[PDB]
Design a protein around this ligand. Structure first.
Ligand SMILES: [Zn+2]
Ligand SMILES: [Zn+2]
Ligand SMILES: [Zn+2]
Ligand SMILES: [Zn+2]
Ligand SMILES: [Zn+2]
Ligand SMILES: [Zn+2]
Ligand SMILES: [Zn+2]
Ligand SMILES: [Zn+2]
Ligand SMILES: [Zn+2]
Ligand SMILES: [Zn+2]
Lengths: 201, 201
């Protein structure tokens, strides 16, 4: 698709399912990383995107936006988390210096004020779909009015290296349940391929 | 957005970036899991989706489709991989029996024949965007012509339990670099919060 809501494609909101400040921020961050790199969105498996967040962080919606803006998705094996707890992305394409993008602390301080209504709802436990548009639309409008430079900082990293997980497409029927199992995940039980649930159980 | 290409929303293809058989299969699987469960797409953080694939499996594009169909995304903390190497999903909403959906081996055998052109290109190393439409469009048309029952099997699991990762939104300025760091990922160095890169380096 192709049409914008608060400067973010409408499709990105349909993927994510709701309006919140972090998915747009992640989208903006991913777009900015590409602009800096002089790259277009990734259609295939060439460029890597690493988020500095961890699974324990709230606001992981940032990662949906980042994947959405760059085409470096978790499913394609191009998106991963480093676990540092920072609102930052590292775009890396082998043979080039990686680009790190960080959301400014000063932007975060202003977002806390600007989006206090939205965050008060979230603190009480209301899911984003239950939050009134008046509490979120002005925040997204504000974010869309800012230049990339007002939200983010960046730098090139010199010695960055990253080797992704080695992938394998071969499959074999599990000896116990009969289901096709990717060889990479099959266990051997007396010379026969067995899926993990049947091996360990 | 809202318009279909081969029975899959056009937006899902823009997110993923290219045409391949597995993203649509994952989309179909996720949609079927919801239909069986009697649930609508997840706008927020209520339902969990677990893929039985691992990061070492080729065809992880299945996972983009699954997230896209269900609204159970990796960014929202609702999507995870179990690492069994099966083309299967488990939809789970606390207080109900989980639903497991498996892509039939027989469907996989027919896909190998039906999509031999596409897979020959992939075996040579051509990325999906470089593959001619004639090698992929008839495969997607075929998939759209099949009923859910022709592609998948399902079952309810009785004793399924899953506790997601405990999340925390609090942040503190790292004592060394000054960057806001989610407390959940901060290290303590003589009573001061330090981000992992500054702690370990
Ligand atoms: Zn969100
Ligand atoms: Zn910074
Ligand atoms: Zn107010
Ligand atoms: Zn609620
Ligand atoms: Zn098995
Ligand atoms: Zn794909
Ligand atoms: Zn089966
Ligand atoms: Zn041919
Ligand atoms: Zn190529
Ligand atoms: Zn630090």
């Amino acid at each position: 698709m192709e049409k914008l809501n608060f400067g973010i494609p409408e499709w990105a909101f349909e993927f994510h399912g709701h309006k919140c400040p972090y998915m747009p921020m992640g989208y903006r961050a991913g777009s900015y990383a590409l602009k800096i790199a002089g790259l277009e969105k990734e259609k295939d498996h060439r460029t890597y995107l690493l988020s500095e967040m961890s699974p324990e962080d709230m606001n992981g919606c940032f990662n949906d936006g980042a994947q959405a803006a760059t085409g470096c998705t978790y499913g394609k094996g191009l998106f991963s988390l480093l676990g540092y707890g920072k609102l930052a992305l590292i775009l890396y394409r082998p043979g080039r210096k990686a680009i790190r993008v960080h959301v400014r602390n000063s932007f975060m301080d202003e977002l806390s004020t600007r989006a206090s209504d939205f965050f008060r709802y979230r603190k009480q436990g209301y899911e984003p779909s239950e939050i009134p548009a008046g509490a979120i639309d002005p925040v997204l409008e504000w974010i869309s009015s800012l230049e990339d430079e007002e939200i983010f900082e960046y730098r090139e990293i010199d010695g960055f290296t990253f080797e992704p997980v080695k992938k394998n497409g071969a499959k074999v029927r599990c000896d116990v349940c009969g289901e096709y199992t990717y060889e990479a995940d099959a266990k051997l039980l007396n010379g026969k391929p067995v899926c993990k649930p049947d091996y360990y159980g």
